Symmetry: none
Subunit: 261 residues, 2 copies
C-alpha cells in the first residue's frame, strides 16, 4: 500500500514484462515481480513492456523508469498528473514568486549543510556557494578513498556516482509523485524534466549514497553498475530513505510560509 511500507527499487534486466493471470511477470524463466510492493521499477536495455504491465504499474502506484548504462535516465511512466489541483497550484505559487522561491531554497540549503545560508543572498549566489562546497566535498571524498579525481563529469568513479544517484532519483521521483507534485517544477534547479527531483535528492545525496560510490570505485570494478545498485538497495533499506523523503518534500515547500493544502 503506502510508499513508506514498500521496497525501494527493483531492477529488471532483459526480457519481456507482461501480466499473466493478473500477476506482473518478467520472462526471458518466468519471474513474479510484487509490483504493488515496490516504489520504483527500473527497466534496463533489452526489456520490452506490454500495455497490460504499464497499466497495472500505474494502477498500483508504482513508477516505471527506463534507464540506460550507468542508470542514465531514458524515460518514466506513471499515473497521469497530480490528481489534486490544490497541491499543484501550491507548488507553482511558490515557484513563480521570487521571495517565496528564495525562502524554499534557503530551507533546502540549511537542510543540505545543516547550517543556515549567509543572510541576504540571492538564489544565484546561493547556487554558487552550494557549487563551491560540493566541489570541495567530492575532492575530499576522492582523497579519503584514494581515488583519482579530475572533477564531476568515463572515469570509473563518475560511472559509480551516476549509477548511484540515478537510483536515488528514481526513489525521489516516486515520492514526489506520491505527494501529488510535479517533478518538473524546481526551485534550485529549473528547466529540466526532473528539476524538483534533483533539488530534493541533492539535500541527502552525500549522507551515504555518494560516499558508497567512492567506496566501490576504489576497488577498481570493471562493471560497477550491478554492485552500486545493490549497495543503494541496501542503503535505502537501512537508512529508511523512503520514510525520510515524504516529510522532507513537505518541509521544504512549507518554508515558503504559505498555508499548505
Amino acid at each position: 500500500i503506502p510508499l513508506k511500507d514498500r521496497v525501494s527499487m527493483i531492477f529488471l534486466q532483459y526480457g519481456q514484462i507482461d501480466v499473466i493471470d493478473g500477476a506482473f511477470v518478467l520472462i526471458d524463466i518466468r519471474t513474479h515481480i510484487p509490483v504493488g510492493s515496490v516504489a520504483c521499477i527500473m527497466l534496463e536495455p533489452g526489456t520490452r513492456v506490454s500495455h497490460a504491465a504499464v497499466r497495472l504499474a500505474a494502477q498500483v502506484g508504482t513508477l516505471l523508469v527506463w534507464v540506460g548504462e550507468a542508470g542514465v535516465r531514458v524515460y518514466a511512466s506513471g499515473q497521469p498528473g497530480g490528481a489534486r489541483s490544490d497541491k499543484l497550484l501550491y507548488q507553482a505559487k511558490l515557484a513563480l514568486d521570487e521571495d517565496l522561491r528564495l525562502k524554499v531554497v534557503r530551507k533546502m540549503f540549511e537542510l543540505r549543510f545543516g547550517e543556515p545560508a549567509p543572510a541576504r543572498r540571492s538564489v544565484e549566489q546561493l547556487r554558487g556557494i552550494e557549487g563551491s562546497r560540493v566541489r570541495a566535498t567530492y575532492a575530499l571524498l576522492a582523497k579519503q578513498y584514494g581515488v583519482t579525481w579530475n572533477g564531476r563529469r568515463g572515469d570509473t568513479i563518475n560511472q559509480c556516482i551516476s549509477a548511484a544517484t540515478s537510483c536515488l532519483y528514481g526513489v525521489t521521483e516516486a515520492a514526489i509523485l506520491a505527494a501529488g507534485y510535479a517533478p518538473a517544477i524546481g526551485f534550485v534547479h529549473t528547466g529540466k524534466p526532473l528539476s524538483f527531483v534533483y533539488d530534493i535528492a541533492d539535500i541527502i545525496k552525500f549522507d551515504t549514497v555518494v560516499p558508497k560510490a567512492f567506496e566501490i570505485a576504489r576497488r577498481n570494478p570493471g562493471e560497477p553498475d550491478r554492485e552500486v545498485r545493490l549497495a543503494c538497495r541496501d542503503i535505502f533499506r537501512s537508512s529508511k530513505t523512503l520514510a525520510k523523503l515524504i516529510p522532507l518534500i513537505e518541509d521544504v515547500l512549507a518554508a515558503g510560509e504559505i498555508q499548505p493544502p
Copy 2:
C-alpha cells in the same frame, strides 16, 4: 509546432534496422513518424521495446497508454509533465482572477461562435452555457437535415450515435492536454476535480466535434446495421483531421490570457 496525435494498437513497436516501426497483428511492418507527432496513444495489445521508448524520448514525443479508441488514459510518460514553462504558464493563468476570466470568456466564444455577455462572472457564464445547450443541438440537426426531438439500443439512431460518439471524448481530451504539456487537474470553469481542465476543453470539443460528427454519421446512414453505426460513432476520434485540431484548440484557449505563450 508538432500537433498530430496517432493511435497504435495490437502490435509490437521497436527499432529494427534503424527504423521506428509497428509490426501489426498480421505481420505487416509500418514506419511510424515518431519525431513528427506530439503524442502516440498506445491502445491495448501494444508491446514497446526499450529502444523504441528511448527514441521517442529523444525526439520529445509523449507516450500515453489508453483504452480502446481513447476511452481512457491509464498511464502517461514523463509524469506530471516534461516542461515547467508550460505547467507554470497554465498555473499563472489559473491563479490570477483577471486572467482566469479572460480564458473562460475565450472558452465561451469557441463554444458558441460569439462573445458572451459583457459583465459576467465565471459562474454566470456557466449558467448561460447551460442555458443554450438545447439550442445548439437543434441548430446542428437543421444543419445536417436530421429529424430531432431532443437529447435523450436506447432509442433514436441520432441519440445512440451521440452517446457512442461521446464515449471517448474525456480520454482523448485528457490525452491531448497531456500532449500539449498541461496538467489535467488545473481548470478554469470546472475546479476541484482530478480532470477539471479536461471537462473545460471537452465541453468545447463536444459541440465543435462530437455532436456534429454524430449528426454526419446519422445523416449519411443508408439504414446500416446499428451495431456498425454505433461502432463508427465510437471511433470518431480515429480521424487524423480531428486529432490534429485538439492541441491547437487548447493553446488558443490559454492564449486568451494575453501572456506570451511558452
